[PDB]
């Protein structure tokens, strides 16, 4: 992608933070966000606001009033529209030059290859249900597709306990635990000699608050923001190693 | 006092399930002021609206600029040139049409701070980036025991997991916080106490600053928004703790 003057105006602050090479790297990147909800809608926003030049959004759910407490697209006039389309329209308002694709579908074990094989720079997995989540992680891991997944973000109030570690090492996260169990039984994914699954997971050390679970923007959005920052760090590091 | 509607419970049922029923009403009855609707404050304002805060005041007189796009939730193609506080207020009304939103189209000064703080806020979130008015706001809220959380510099930082809350005296790697301490002392007589604390809660990051990489500091949504989100979570926790302690 050739960066226009308007793009340099919008993302001058990105360039001043990450550098010119990173700005170009981001403009040339294509990142996929799967699940445009409490975590993924903010991830998508952050990607757009950091000069990522191409974004794919995968979700088939609509905006509901009950999303209001934790999803950036949940506004009165958006209720009943497709989440992914509302977020795509917002991204075009953030960066009119971003290449935005909507996949109006849910990821399944049956279709993940079709969806994941377009060649993404990174995949951010913000799915809440274990079966498709395991199928997505297993596929990206096998195919060496850069992935960051997110554990359970509900039932938590403290954004400062969010961190990234190998999926094998998460604690206080029942979703991540169920995911490990399904990866093992259904996909043969098991931890290596060093006790790692080779899957990066955003999780929180906070113990869950039972009232399903409630949620707050301040936590669920930070899950998405930490996923994006982690992906960009890994992308920049890889680019720095080439040469 | 706000009567919580059935629509409010649809919007904020997840808030009640997380913080509790008493908290839902506490939030609906609260009036929180966000000073500075920029890289930090615009996301704080968003988070307050989405957590069922019943009245929000926004204080800023700046306009949306295309260069805000990297880090401010209101920075959209069609908002460029409009007043930030008014754009953000209209958004809050779309989030919660029953939220009482007040716009103060002004900057805080030593001359006007008492008037603007005279409404009796449940909490003040200080997201000012300029030291002069920041010091005046902090000194006033501190003297008057007005609940306040301030934010250091969120620019020049890339790692959201290093953001935390501490006493303003103990921040590191934050030149804005450093200048602010100096102005508080020289202009307002605010100095640290026996325990070395200023008695002001400050959001900062332990991350070392990243200096400008092209042609001041750069910034990213993932960090500046998390400053605002950590500030809101801290304020809501302190409000809940105070309500529980009355009893
Ligand atoms: N298999 C899948 N592929 C892609 N997206 C998915 C899949 N399964 C779920 N999603 C989406 O992931 C998102 C998760 O959002 P989140 O957990 O914040 O709450 P929600 O599902 O919108 O609300 P609620 O939990 O009350 O139904 C949702 O938008 C959902 O539609
Ligand atoms: N005295 C004040 N009273 C109220 N709001 C203020 C005051 N001083 C500054 N602010 C606001 O704090 C916000 C800070 O935003 P941030 O530092 O992320 O970038 P910015 O200042 O918007 O960028 P730029 O300086 O390039 O326009 C601004 O919107 C500014 O108007
Ligand atoms: K947890
Ligand atoms: K710092
Ligand atoms: Na942290």
Author numbering:
A (entry chain A): 3 to 213, 237 to 268
B (entry chain B): 2 to 216, 237 to 268
Please give sentences taken from the publication describing this entry:
The enzyme responsible for t6A cyclization in E. coli was identified by comparative genomic approaches and analysis of LC/MS data sets of genomic deletion strains (ribonucleotide analysis) as CsdL, subsequently renamed to TcdA, for tRNA threonylcarbamoyladenosine dehydratase A. TcdA is an ubiquitin-activating E1-like protein with detectable homology to the adenylyltransferases MoeB and ThiF. To further the understanding of ct6A biology we have determined the high-resolution crystal structures of CsdL/TcdA in complex with AMP and ATP, an E1-like activating enzyme from Escherichia coli, which catalyzes the ATP-dependent dehydration of t6A to form ct6A. CsdL/TcdA is a dimer whose structural integrity and dimer interface depend critically on strongly bound K+ and Na+ cations. The tertiary structure of monomeric TcdA consists of seven β-strands in a continuous sheet surrounded by eight α-helices.
To shed light onto the structural basis for the tRNA binding and ct6A synthetic properties of TcdA-ATP, we determined the crystal structure of E. coli TcdA loaded with ATP to 1.77 Å resolution (R/Rfree values of 0.139/0.176) and AMP to 1.89 Å resolution (R/Rfree values of 0.141/0.183). The asymmetric unit contained four TcdA chains arranged in two independent dimers, with a solvent content of 39%. In the TcdA-ATP complex, ATP is bound in a cleft over the C-terminal end of the central sheet. The residues in the P loop form the floor of the nucleotide triphosphate moiety, and the adenine ring is inserted into a hydrophobic cavity. Specific interactions anchor ATP at the active site through its triphosphate moeity and the ribose hydroxyl groups. The conserved Arg72 and Lys85 contact oxygens from the α- and β-phosphates, while Thr68 and the strictly conserved Asn69 in the H310a helix anchor the γ-phosphate through a water-mediated hydrogen bond. Besides localized changes in the active site, the TcdA-ATP and TcdA-AMP structures are identical (RMSD 0.16 Å over 246 Cα atoms). The TcdA dimer is maintained by Na+, which mediates monomer-monomer contacts through the dimer interface, and by K+ ions, which play a structural role in shaping the monomer fold.
